[PDB]
């Protein structure tokens, strides 16, 4: 297979990966989902004019002076009295403004004159200021108007978006589906983690690592187990993956390519990338029954598997789930140590760290405390060149965020 | 209640919040968990000397020359032959090195001499180089040694840590428990999201927002519903929370404090914070049956609830689940617009954005594309002072990461 450049490989993954269809879900399951419909309000917020303050709903045209308090409007109740000249109604923040009143005067701008004998009721109050019409009242529809679009299709939902659906009472929404991702490992040397060692064998760690990475991003997964490195077993496992899942990931193992090509008639878009690590990374698509499955065969080395998973698989999954720009976030950071550059673009897991009052983070390449912490970035080193053969501590480089 | 400074409030939450006890879990459930035990390897990795390359396992003392190939060692099998003078054994990467061989010569440093008539077997090969002892062999225990501590207590686990547990076959581990968090809303004006509006009422959004925020961080939650703003109903709901959960969060609503103090005998550590928004935030602890419950009563305003939840609740939860430094990550960013400073420290949701080849991100305070994206930071504005009454676009400020 020819050596594909990193840029060609990445663009190829994004271009060939489909966007999944849509489904209707309950709002509370919306975390990380992308809306496939515009969402409109069916009510005004607030639906009644509401007091912004504790105080009194007044007729501004009465001006300052001594008023009879005819009642109280409290949150959650509809007032039934009309405020007439020389009257006011006590209000609390959020309470509906009664008919007849056109402003609110906050309590600090008043002095109580008389209180019921028992002391439970305010009877008369002096209004010390001249209210302007509308003052301290949130009018109907100030925050949201009926028929307004409050969230657009393409919005990637978090907690506040869920709370907005709640506010407008839209509890069922159309969203893109999440990809189901099947993971298998291939290699005759592999045992399950639960197993004791046997001669010549080691425990499979890549399956757990990859499954955990995908789960961390919120996508459902299928564990396809360890698969013998031979055509028959590979074909059976791939067939199961294709049946159960939208995406299949393998690591290890050239029978894989032979099965994909000759047995499955998949399109293998690249089988080698000019990158370090991850040279042997393979990406294929399969069009079957009107839909497109995507298949990644990652290298068996566990650092390579982790790295290629973050570079190629995660952005594909983000596209599949409807995210409009599925590219990862890249930030600037300072190198923590010198690095000789390789002819290939090189990627290294690191821990981004922000120091007191220093504007750029440091990228620590994986003392006491750093070993307590999971990698949250991928240092992206440029390929070797005439001028640049080495980079030094303190120099600013790109780091892909993969974890903060 | 007296006005507590932000710093005193934050330190108080962290100091008074307990660390939860421990439980044993399966490794695959380890995402985001903190190990409560050191983890030791029970085997060497690799457990046998392994070839780093495709090539031939040789006796370095034979030097270069023409060799008989006596067999092949492949991954997953224990070789049963001993390599003698003038012999070599074909090896693939990861295969065990057979007795008698002390180095590996990569295939590119050889030329095949004879192949079986059928062409399926290599019979003789010319070794073109002088191997050094140990060359291209990963020795037993190179990566991990038996009895080595591979993860320390206090490690906050991600995908690679899970994969490390798999590698060493430690499938059950002691971890700190996750806090169970109960959320309720109080307010006579509130209806469930599922409800049509009635006069004077609005839909409760804070419960969904807060529950989604807590769930986003991985903690189990209990929905305690809308609670009438009166002592009897508040006491019943708080009692249910205390029974079912480690942490209780309310928003809205002064009956709450009265119930906490007089009915529950909770310790209310502060009831007002000098901050904007979030002035009325209340934090209390209750020691009952030998354990400590924590209670937050957040303001009813939905921006305030979100903001105080991120500032005070999330760091408490991170402490409860065993994270050794539970403080949030604060980074430097550039203001996107001018801001007049308030006498209180002020917190505003924003979207952090990194621009092409610019080292610091911009903090966009919540065009087409920004409305598609959830807030991922909290701008932390300094209190007003003699010299500083305003900050301008481009100026560098602190932003708490709450979402990237």
């Amino acid at each position: 297979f020819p050596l594909t450049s990193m840029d060609k490989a990445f663009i190829t993954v994004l271009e060939m990966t489909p966007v999944l269809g849509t489904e209707i879900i309950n709002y509370r399951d919306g975390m990380g989902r992308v809306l496939a419909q515009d969402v409109y309000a069916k009510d005004n917020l607030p639906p009644f004019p509401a007091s912004v303050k504790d105080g009194y709903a007044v007729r501004a045209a009465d001006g300052p002076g001594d008023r009879f308090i005819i009642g109280e409007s409290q949150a959650g109740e509809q007032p039934t009295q009309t405020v007439m000249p020389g009257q006011v109604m006590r209000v609390t923040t959020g309470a509906p403004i009664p008919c007849g009143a056109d402003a609110v005067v906050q309590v600090e701008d008043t002095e109580l004159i008389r209180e019921s004998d028992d002391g439970t009721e305010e009877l008369e109050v002096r209004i010390l200021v001249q209210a302007r019409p509308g003052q301290d009242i949130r009018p109907i529809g100030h925050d949201i108007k009926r028929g307004e679009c409050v969230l657009a299709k393409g919005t990637h939902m978090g907690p506040s978006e869920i709370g907005l659906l709640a506010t407008v009472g839209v509890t069922e929404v159309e969203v893109n589906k999440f990809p189901v991702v099947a993971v298998m490992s291939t290699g005759n040397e592999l045992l399950n983690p639960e197993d004791d060692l046997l001669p010549g064998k080691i425990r499979d760690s890549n399956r757990s690592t990859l499954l955990a990475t995908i789960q961390e991003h919120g996508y459902p997964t299928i564990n396809l187990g360890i698969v013998g490195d031979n055509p028959d077993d590979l074909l059976n496992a791939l067939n199961e993956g294709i049946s159960r899942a939208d995406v299949i990931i393998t690591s290890g193992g050239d029978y894989l390519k032979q099965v994909l090509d000759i047995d499955l008639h998949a399109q293998i878009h690249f089988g080698r990338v000019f990158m370090k690590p991850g040279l042997p990374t393979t990406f294929a698509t399969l069009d079957i029954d009107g839909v497109r499955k995507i298949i990644f065969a990652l290298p068996g080395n566990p650092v390579s598997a982790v790295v290629t998973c973050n570079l190629f698989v995660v952005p594909a999954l983000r596209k599949m789930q409807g995210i409009l720009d599925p590219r990862p976030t890249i930030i600037k950071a300072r190198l923590s140590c010198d690095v000789k550059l390789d002819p290939r673009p090189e990627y290294h897991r690191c821990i981004l760290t922000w120091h007191h009052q220093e504007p750029l983070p440091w990228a620590q390449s994986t003392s006491r405390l750093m070993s307590m912490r999971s990698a949250n970035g991928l240092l992206m080193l440029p390929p070797k060149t005439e001028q640049y053969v080495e980079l030094h501590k303190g120099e600013v480089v790109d780091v892909m965020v993969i974890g903060l | 209640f007296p006005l507590t400074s932000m710093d005193k409030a934050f330190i108080t939450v962290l100091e008074m919040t307990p660390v939860l006890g421990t439980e044993i879990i399966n490794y695959r459930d380890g995402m985001g968990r903190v190990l409560a035990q050191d983890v030791y390897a029970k085997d060497n990795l690799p457990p046998f000397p392994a070839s780093v390359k495709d090539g031939y396992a040789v006796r370095a003392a034979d030097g270069p020359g023409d060799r008989f190939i006596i067999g092949e060692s492949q991954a997953g099998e224990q070789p049963t032959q001993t390599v003698m003078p003038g012999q070599v054994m074909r090896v693939t990467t990861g295969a065990p090195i057979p007795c008698g061989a002390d180095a590996v010569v990569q295939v590119e440093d050889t030329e095949l001499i004879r192949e079986s008539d059928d062409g399926t077997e290599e019979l003789e090969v010319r070794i073109l180089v002088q191997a050094r002892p140990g060359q291209d062999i990963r020795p037993i225990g190179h990566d991990i040694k038996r009895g080595e501590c591979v993860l320390a207590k206090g490690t906050h686990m991600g995908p690679s840590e899970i994969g490390l547990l798999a590698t060493v076959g430690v499938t059950e581990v002691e971890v700190n428990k996750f806090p169970v968090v109960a959320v309720m809303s109080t307010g006579n004006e509130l209806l469930n999201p599922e409800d049509d509006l009635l006069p004077g009422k609005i839909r409760d959004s804070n419960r969904s927002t807060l529950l989604a925020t807590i769930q986003e961080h991985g903690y189990p939650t209990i929905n305690l519903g809308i609670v009438g703003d009166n002592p009897d109903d508040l006491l019943n709901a708080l009692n249910e929370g205390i029974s079912r959960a480690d942490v209780i969060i309310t928003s809205g609503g002064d009956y709450l404090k009265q119930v906490l103090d007089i009915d529950l005998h909770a310790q209310i550590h502060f009831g007002r914070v000098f901050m904007k928004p979030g002035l009325p935030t209340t934090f209390a602890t209750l020691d009952i049956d030998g354990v400590r419950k924590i209670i937050f009563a957040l303001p009813g305003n939905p921006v305030s609830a979100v903001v105080t939840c991120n500032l005070f609740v999330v760091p408490a939860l991170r402490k409860m689940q065993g994270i050794l430094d539970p403080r949030p990550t604060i980074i430097k960013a550039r203001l996107s617009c001018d801001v007049k400073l308030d006498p209180r420290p002020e917190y505003h949701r924003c979207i952090l954005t990194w621009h092409h080849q610019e080292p610091l991100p911009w903090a966009q305070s919540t065009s087409r594309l920004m409305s598609m994206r959830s807030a991922n930071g909290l701008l932390m504005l300094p209190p007003k002072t003699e010299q500083y009454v305003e900050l301008h676009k481009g100026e560098v400020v602190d932003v708490m990461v709450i979402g990237l």
Partner: peptide
């Protein structure tokens, strides 16, 4: 321009 290849230290 976006690139998945690291850039030289500006």
């Amino acid at each position: 321009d976006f690139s998945i290849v690291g850039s030289l230290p500006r």
